[PDB]
Amino acid sequence: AARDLICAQKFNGLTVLPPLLTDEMIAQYTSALLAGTITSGWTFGAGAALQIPFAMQMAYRFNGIGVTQNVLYENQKLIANQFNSAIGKIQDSLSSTAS
Amino acid sequence: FCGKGYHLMSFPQSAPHGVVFLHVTYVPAQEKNFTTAPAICHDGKAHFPREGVFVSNGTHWFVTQRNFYEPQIITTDNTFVSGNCDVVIGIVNNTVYDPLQPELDS
Ligand SMILES: *[C@@H]1O[C@H](CO)[C@@H](O)[C@H](O)[C@H]1NC(C)=O
Ligand SMILES: *[C@@H]1O[C@H](CO)[C@@H](O)[C@H](O)[C@H]1NC(C)=O
Numbered sequence: 001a002a003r004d005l006i007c008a009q010k011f012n013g014l015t016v017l018p019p020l021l022t023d024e025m026i027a028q029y030t031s032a033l034l035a036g037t038i039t040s041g042w043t044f045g046a047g048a049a050l051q052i053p054f055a056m057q058m059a060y061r062f063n064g065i066g067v068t069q070n071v072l073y074e075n076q077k078l079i080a081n082q083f084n085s086a087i088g089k090i091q092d093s094l095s096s097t098a099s
Numbered sequence: 100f101c102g103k104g105y106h107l108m109s110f111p112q113s114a115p116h117g118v119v120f121l122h123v124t125y126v127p128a129q130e131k132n133f134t135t136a137p138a139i140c141h142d143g144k145a146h147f148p149r150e151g152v153f154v155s156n157g158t159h160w161f162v163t164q165r166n167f168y169e170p171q172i173i174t175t176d177n178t179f180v181s182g183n184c185d186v187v188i189g190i191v192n193n194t195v196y197d198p199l200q201p202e203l204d205s
Contacts, residue, residue: 046104047127056137056152060165066154069180070147073137076188 105166106134126167136160139173140184141195147179160193172196 001007033083036044043050059069110121126130134155139146151162161170174196
């Protein structure tokens, strides 16, 4: 007990309550959101999820920032590789930095 | 931010100590599958929709607006050209109609 402050807290009437949603449920929610985004774009936020090929959704986004979609289609492998490299950097940074 | 769906308009109503917003939204209703393509190859040139998306009913290719199925013939007023037919992944061949060809023929 002495080597644990939680025991003193509990002995003096101070307790921590668990969240209603478990970590598994929150991960389920995040995976549902991710699946909706990568399969249907923004359609599942407004109504039923409407499937669309991912490259065509990316073309929609490029239109959304004022770039013609042929820029997306003609550089599709370059764009996908840049995204993959950026995700890899996120991974490496998380594996390196502890704070 | 203003209800679920694509916001159209909102109406305020007063309530004690608060406000009630009646959000009017547009919700797409009855979706149908289609075969789609990123671009159309017609004469060694890639074509892309100006505003919509290419859809196939199974045998014929149309362009439609993205949020409401309204299939239209694929024409040069419907599309814009960029490059040849070698870079785009998933391009399909189909005819792109020229409105001025019959007029020149007539
Ligand atoms: C589209 O086809 C798939 C293939 O099985 C089917 O699961 C899905 O329900 C269909 N959707 C519509 C809207 O017809
Ligand atoms: C589309 O047309 C090109 C050019 O003639 C041809 O090489 C290709 O095989 C065609 N694709 C299909 C699926 O018929």
